[PDB]
A paper describes a structure:
Gene transfer agents (GTAs) are DNA-containing phage-like particles produced by some species of bacteria and archaea. The genes encoding proteins that form [name] [name] particles (RcGTA) are derived from phage DNA, which has been integrated into the bacterial genome. Here, we use cryo-electron microscopy (cryo-EM) to determine the structures of RcGTA before and after DNA ejection, and to visualize the interactions of RcGTA with [name] cells. Particles of RcGTA have heads with a diameter of 38-nm and 49-nm long tails.
The asymmetric reconstruction of the native particle of RcGTA has an overall resolution of 4.3 Å, and symmetrized reconstructions of the head, portal complex, tail, and baseplate have resolutions of 3.3–4.5Å. Asymmetric reconstruction of the RcGTA particle at a resolution of 4.3 Å enabled characterization of the interface between the capsid and portal complex. Incorporation of the portal complex into the capsid is enabled by changes in the structure of the major capsid proteins relative to their structures in the rest of the capsid. Residues 99–106 from the N-termini of major capsid proteins interacting with the portal are tilted 18° away from the portal complex relative to their orientation in other capsid proteins. This conformational change enables the N-terminus to fit inside a groove formed by the wing domain of the portal complex and peripheral domain and extended loop of the capsid protein. The asymmetric reconstruction of the RcGTA particle shows that interactions of the capsid with portal and adaptor complexes induce deviations of the structures from their ideal fivefold and twelvefold symmetries, respectively. By contrast, an asymmetric reconstruction of the portal and adaptor complexes of RcGTA, determined to a resolution of 4.3 Å, does not show any unique interactions between the portal or adaptor proteins and the packaged DNA. Therefore, the DNA is probably held in the RcGTA head by the tape measure proteins and iris-like constriction within the baseplate, which block the tail channel. Furthermore, the end of the DNA packaged in the native RcGTA particle extends through the channel formed by the hexamer of stopper proteins and continues into the disc of tail terminator proteins.
Author numbering:
A (entry chain A5): 146 to 385
B (entry chain B5): 109 to 179, 186 to 385
C (entry chain 2L), F (entry chain 2A): 1 to 171, 175 to 197
D (entry chain 1B), E (entry chain 1C): 24 to 78, 89 to 393
The structure:
């Protein structure tokens, strides 16, 4: 407050301190391998199962980071109590509406993009990015002008410019596609807007003693995640 | 490390004239009019042509205060000092733009604006866009370019636009009859930061596009707006008053209004 | 942590007609109802005595647990022990707005530790300067027949005593009032920080 | 290096790796908090700065920057290695060769970046929300990163204070036990019990001010020590004691004060802690100090300055401690000069080459 | 340097940074309060003033100003470094080179200003509410700022008293425990209990003056020690004791009296505190004192006077401790002269060059 | 800290018609003869004996807590335990200007330790000489029926005792007067500086 001379200034509000908890859930796979099949074959089965487990976990937790609920798995940002931007509060994430219910708005496509970029807020756009799946970026490139040329990477050759409105694009295939109310495009500073807590190892272990004709591998990693800063992620609602 | 919400930092401080002052006020001295010299006649009296009436505008140098109570993982002294400096950098930004007279610097929007072409000294000049809701429908950006070219060639050597984020949004939403984005043509460009050859300052305390709001300003604020201040920040690390809460006392004193009424031109979204 | 009751017991759920059989009043008199106003006054005075010594509930009336800061980071053990189906953890704000929250909290039923443990490793946060009231219905059953009978007997051993002596006049059983209560009291040995 | 690419991806290339959170709090609770952790680092960092060096390059080391001398630099450098296991040295090069500025960047606010091949590409000096992103994708590599040995971590050091972090909190809290015991304790030297005719009875404020004035004047103080103190009916004086008087966690503090000195490697005789005589007569304990925890530390840091600073020069330079005219090693110098000086069989120039003299 | 420019704008450029809050209260409670903290600073500050120096400029140091001699200057200078981690020296320069005034500015009333690029631009001497604002935006830079090593702070020192601030409050309050125990304590040497026929009964003031006068005359004092003391019916003598007699926090004070001496680095033998024999015979403990906490401290301040005062001269001057004819290092001088003097193999002029002699 | 009551009970809030039934209903001489206003004078004597041993209030009377200096920095535990809704925290100065405050504090209700617990660390400071003064309404409910019935029975076990025998005459019940009170007493273990 601007302090007057004859005011005898009162104390002001100490800012509330929030404490948001990462639950840090577990993620494990237990493949059952035969002992004879592991002893006879020419392929390195203990290596191949490790490769497939390490491929599976980095995709299962990738879908958890986007669309997982709070309980039993890390919660993704798209599951959180979102509100229209302008009506924004801390206990939510902001969206902007695109216009038409099916797709982008007919009279001005990408106009739903260029206002979300400037609705995110100027401080988090220092290092921000877009997040989409593949067939949303397809529909983004299919946005054309009145003539028929492309708004983004104008020439029909030399595609994927890795730069949308000055900010990078992450093709994360675990977002919903374009639908009646689905949120296909997300934008913001996810380095400050989403915290991942994890135990950074893939512990893998054989124990034939559980199932005795078999080997029964078991690999496990635990990752937890939620939003750190609610003011750093905005979304596109394809509704109104 | 404790986090916080990241607020806007751009504050009109880096484009206005920052003057270190030590007294209670800062008096700028501007003449209101011209010499009025005429071409002399060969047989005439020729005396007392005129004299510029000077005017003292007073920067009152108000003070700003925020008083939080403190009430070993993260250390409060450094963190609260890094939050209250941000709040003093952001709360003076609102006063520099739309502050009123009482106890705070009067921003450049609160200076009784008069339509340009009937411009006098005691006010700021604006240019109208057209329809009241937004930019003109037939020719967008004509309001922007004649806002630029209705200012004066001496101040346009180093002048800048002042908007918030969602007015620069509505500027970048301008498109031709094919829809090709007059400003930063592709979807791969970004913020071009050189509108009409001049820089853009995204200051969030500007109003947005409304029925009569002055959402776009343009000017050489180095001559226009004078921020007179004292550079330090008071730090009363108070160990009294309340045993439970430290109740740190931090204050910076700062003042400012417009020094030159010709430098700043506004865009009124009306007829 | 205030822990008031939303609704009391109906009174018609109390076994006044069976407590009268206990106290040996009389069988076939035409009056039969001169004590009804006072017999349930001692049954409510003996249940509420055993509800405090055992921290049990016994009629499954609805409660309201209005508290502000969580006792431990995630657990929040409830005081009234035999619980079922916590209705609402509506999170009030500093002033006014009451937003009920599904919030990803669970309920761990137990007669000893009726926790409300959260699944996301942190219960829903609390707006600074605002309370978090929890509506829950805790007790054994709705009617008197759904009780453990030894605890129901400890009401009848106790409310018969208040009926037979009015003021504090002094007057050893194998399973008395106290020895029936003691398997329903809360056995705690923590005086610590956590 | 061939396996370098595999560990880099797991951590995540291009992203800062922080390591230990609580590093800044061990400084305030273990180095600004207790004297044993304070003296142990100050005893070492003022010892490694005093040791001369053997090579030009040392002209930079003699005057690194403004307001931060040669001896003041290594106190800042080793004082970060003992505290947080990591040493950092920014070099500012206005000139192409032998950059004329050195700055010890504190290791609280520095973070590594793993990069592509596992060896680092970025260092991030992070003050407030502000980063810098120093770059290691070049030949001069502007920051030398001195690691203490850490077997489990791939990017930082171990910081001996972390290994003694339990024994610091014993010594901090046992010392604060006796402080708050001297500040929260009610011992009385007695109690004048007044029961009365009943089991309970107060005495009137007339009688109570009488009881103070005969206690204030005639019984308290040094000068009234031992008055015979008539007690009438009802009154009685029960003298209280204070049964643990000395020695509140006295040996567990004195044992934790030695385990802190154990981890940094100082002997108990140098720092001044009490304890059993292990070393004898300071010709040993000062020689043991500059041989088990100073000169191995200094020859490891000087070996990193011998390689990082030679990357700015053309020719590589060696840079080692002197291990000569350091006056704590005189018992190893008497013992080696009197051995060869008494060997009269071999000639004069044959022992000048042994003791290190230029022969004549 | 580059990191510093970022660090400034976090704290705030152009505004004073104060640092320690309690450093004005640790002086009164830790240097004017207890003898151990008093003697420890006086033992060091009177030792650094006694050490000669090796270079004109020293003519300034010999006579800095009126009423403040050479030895009195370093007692004031080191006495601020040991107390508050910071040393200050104002120079008044009527003349361009070698300014003829030095003044130890006390570090309670001095505050730094970070300035633009992180390295300081202002120092603010604040007494009352009145300031001075010394300026560092020039070449001579009129204040040398000697920092003790502080790992967490960027502008001040650590001040070993801050590290011993728990052991000061133990030693201050345990010593004040025994003071107020000798001043607030009622011990009686007995109690003549008079019950009576009832459980309670007073005795009349006729009987009571009889009871005083037979106690005043015949029973108290040295000369009446042990009279057989007939007790009739009703009377009874209960002798009281005093169960903790000696030793009220005697070892916890003596352990805290050693931790204060530990933090400043003085040995327990020099200051005079009791304790187990660590050093032997004062040829070591005085030699340890001038090698672990005096000469490293003195070579660090003298390295800052060698650079700050050379900014007033044209040519740079070195200024180091003598490390010769300081009589605590005579055991390091016997040991080095008898080693090379007994080495008869190398010739006469070959050992005058080793011992530091002018060759012949 | 005077802590005088603003208003007492009305007297018509007390269960005199019910206490006649706890005295002799269902068994007895008849309704008999009891000085009605005498029976009101023993209920006010038994409540004021249990209001003192439990530090509760039981009728929800209005209080005025006028104390000079704040004990803690911010906490200010209120003595009369079951509280609701501070009426006003008006602050008088040494002359009597009586300037109330309306924000800066949030009463945190609780049956154990009711507090004032201002926001942050700043609780309204005291004018030198000008005592602070807090008006609050403390107690369970406005009528007698809103009480915990075990505490209400401790009044009836005690007020009947003052009715049955007048002087201090001699006379170990399981849930007597004392056993019904002990779960409402204040359990404190601080004798220290905070």
């Amino acid at each position: 407050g601007w302090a007057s001379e004859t005011a005898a200034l009162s104390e002001t509000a100490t800012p509330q301190i929030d404490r948001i908890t990462i639950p840090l859930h577990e993620l494990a796979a237990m493949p059952k391998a035969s002992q004879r099949l592991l002893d006879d074959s020419a392929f390195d089965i203990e290596t191949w199962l490790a490769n497939r487990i390490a491929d599976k976990f980095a995709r299962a937790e990738a879908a958890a980071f986007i669309s997982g609920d709070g309980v039993d798995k890390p919660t993704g940002f798209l599951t959180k109590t979102k509100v229209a931007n302008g009506a924004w509060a801390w206990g939510s994430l902001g969206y902007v509406a695109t216009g038409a219910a099916g797709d982008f708005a007919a009279v001005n496509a990408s106009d739903a993009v260029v206002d979300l970029v400037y609705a995110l807020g100027a401080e988090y756009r220092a290092n921000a990015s877009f997040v989409m799946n593949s067939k949303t970026a397809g529909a983004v490139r299919k946005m054309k002008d009145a003539d028929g040329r492309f708004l983004w990477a104008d020439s029909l050759a030399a595609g994927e410019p890795a730069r949308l409105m000055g900010y990078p694009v992450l093709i994360a295939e675990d977002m919903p596609d374009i639908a009646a109310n689905a949120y296909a495009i997300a934008f913001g500073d996810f380095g400050n807007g989403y915290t991942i807590a994890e135990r950074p190892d893939l512990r893998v272990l054989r124990d034939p003693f559980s199932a005795k004709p078999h080997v029964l591998f078991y690999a496990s990693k635990r990752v937890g995640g939620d939003v750190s800063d609610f003011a750093a992620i905005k979304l596109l609602k394809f509704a109104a | 490390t404790i986090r916080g919400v990241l607020r806007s930092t751009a504050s009109l401080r880096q484009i206005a004239s920052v003057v270190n002052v030590e007294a209670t006020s800062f008096d700028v001295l501007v003449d209101k009019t011209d010499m009025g010299s005429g071409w002399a006649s060969e047989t005439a009296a020729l005396s007392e042509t005129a004299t510029p009436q000077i005017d003292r505008i007073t920067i009152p140098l108000h003070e700003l205060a925020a008083m939080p109570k403190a009430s070993s993982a993260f250390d409060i002294e450094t963190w609260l000092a890094n939050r209250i400096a941000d709040k003093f950098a952001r709360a003076e930004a609102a006063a520099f733009i739309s502050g009123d007279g009482v106890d705070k610097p009067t921003g450049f929007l609160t200076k009784t604006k008069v339509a340009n072409g009937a411009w006098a000294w005691g006010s700021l000049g604006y240019v109208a866009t057209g329809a009241a809701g937004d930019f003109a429908a037939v020719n967008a950006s004509d309001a922007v370019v004649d806002l630029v070219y209705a200012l004066g060639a001496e101040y346009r050597a180093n002048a800048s636009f002042v908007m918030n984020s969602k007015t620069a949004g509505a500027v970048r939403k301008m498109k031709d009859a094919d829809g090709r984005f007059l400003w930063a043509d592709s979807l791969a460009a970004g913020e071009p930061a050189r509108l009409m050859g001049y820089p853009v300052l995204i200051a969030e305390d500007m109003p947005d596009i409304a029925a009569n709001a002055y959402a776009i300003a343009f000017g050489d604020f180095g001559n226009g707006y004078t921020i007179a201040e004292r550079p330090d920040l008071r730090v009363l690390r108070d160990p009294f008053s309340a045993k439970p809460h430290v109740l740190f006392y931090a204050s910076k004193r700062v003042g400012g209004d417009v020094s030159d009424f010709a430098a700043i031109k506004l865009l009124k979204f009306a007829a | 942590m205030m822990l008031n009751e939303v609704t009391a017991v109906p009174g018609t759920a109390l076994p006044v007609a069976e407590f009268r059989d206990h106290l040996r009043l009389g069988t076939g008199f035409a009056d039969l109802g001169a004590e009804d106003a006072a017999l349930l006054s001692y049954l409510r005075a003996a249940i509420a005595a055993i509800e405090g010594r055992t921290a049990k509930a016994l009629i499954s009336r609805g409660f309201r647990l209005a508290l502000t800061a969580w006792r431990w980071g995630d657990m929040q053990t409830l005081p009234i022990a035999p619980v079922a189906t916590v209705t609402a953890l509506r999170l009030v704000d500093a002033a006014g707005v009451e937003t009920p929250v599904a919030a990803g909290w669970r309920l761990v039923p137990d007669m000893a530790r009726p926790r409300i443990e959260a699944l996301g490793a942190m219960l829903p946060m609390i707006p600074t300067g605002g309370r978090v009231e929890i509506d829950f219905t805790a007790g054994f059953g709705a009617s008197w027949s759904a009780l453990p009978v030894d605890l129901a007997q400890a009401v009848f051993l106790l409310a018969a005593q208040y009926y037979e002596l009015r003021h504090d006049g002094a007057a050893a059983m194998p399973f008395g009032v106290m020895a029936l209560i003691e398997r329903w009291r809360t056995v705690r040995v923590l005086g610590g920080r956590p | 290096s061939v396996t370098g690419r595999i560990v880099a991806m797991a951590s995540g290339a291009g992203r800062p790796v922080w390591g230990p959170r609580d590093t800044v709090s061990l400084m305030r609770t273990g180095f600004a908090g207790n004297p044993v952790g304070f003296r142990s680092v100050k005893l070492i960092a003022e010892a490694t700065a005093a040791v001369p060096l053997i090579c030009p390059v040392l002209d930079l080391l003699r005057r690194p920057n403004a307001g931060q001398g040669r001896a003041e630099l290594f106190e800042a450098l080793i004082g970060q290695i003992l505290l947080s296991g990591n040493g950092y040295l920014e070099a500012v090069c206005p000139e192409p060769g032998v950059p004329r500025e050195l700055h010890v960047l504190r290791s609280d606010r520095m973070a590594v970046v793993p990069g592509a091949d596992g060896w680092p590409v970025g260092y991030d000096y992070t003050v407030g929300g502000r980063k810098h992103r120093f770059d290691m994708t070049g030949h001069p590599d502007p920051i030398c990163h001195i690691k203490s040995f850490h077997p489990t971590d791939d990017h930082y050091g171990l910081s001996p204070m972390q290994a003694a972090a339990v024994a610091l909190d014993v010594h901090n809290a046992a010392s604060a036990w006796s402080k708050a015991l001297l500040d929260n304790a009610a011992r009385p030297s007695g109690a004048i019990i007044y029961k009365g005719a009943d089991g309970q009875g107060v005495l009137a404020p007339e009688q109570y001010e009488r009881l103070i004035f005969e206690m204030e004047t005639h019984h308290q103080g040094a000068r009234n020590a031992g008055r015979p103190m008539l007690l009438e009916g009802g009154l009685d004086w029960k003298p209280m004691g204070f049964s643990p008087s000395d020695m509140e966690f006295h040996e567990t503090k004195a044992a934790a004060a030695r385990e802190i000195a154990l981890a940094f490697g100082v002997p108990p005789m140098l720092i001044g802690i009490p304890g059993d005589a292990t070393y004898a007569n300071y010709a040993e304990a000062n020689r043991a100090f500059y041989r088990l925890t100073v000169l191995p530390l200094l020859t490891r840091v000087s070996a990193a300055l011998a390689w990082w600073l030679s990357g700015y020069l053309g020719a590589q330079i060696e840079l080692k401690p002197d291990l000569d005219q350091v006056p704590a090693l005189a018992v190893e110098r008497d013992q080696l000069w009197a051995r060869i000086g008494a060997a009269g069989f071999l000639s004069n120039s044959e022992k000048r080459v042994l003791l290190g003299l230029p022969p004549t």
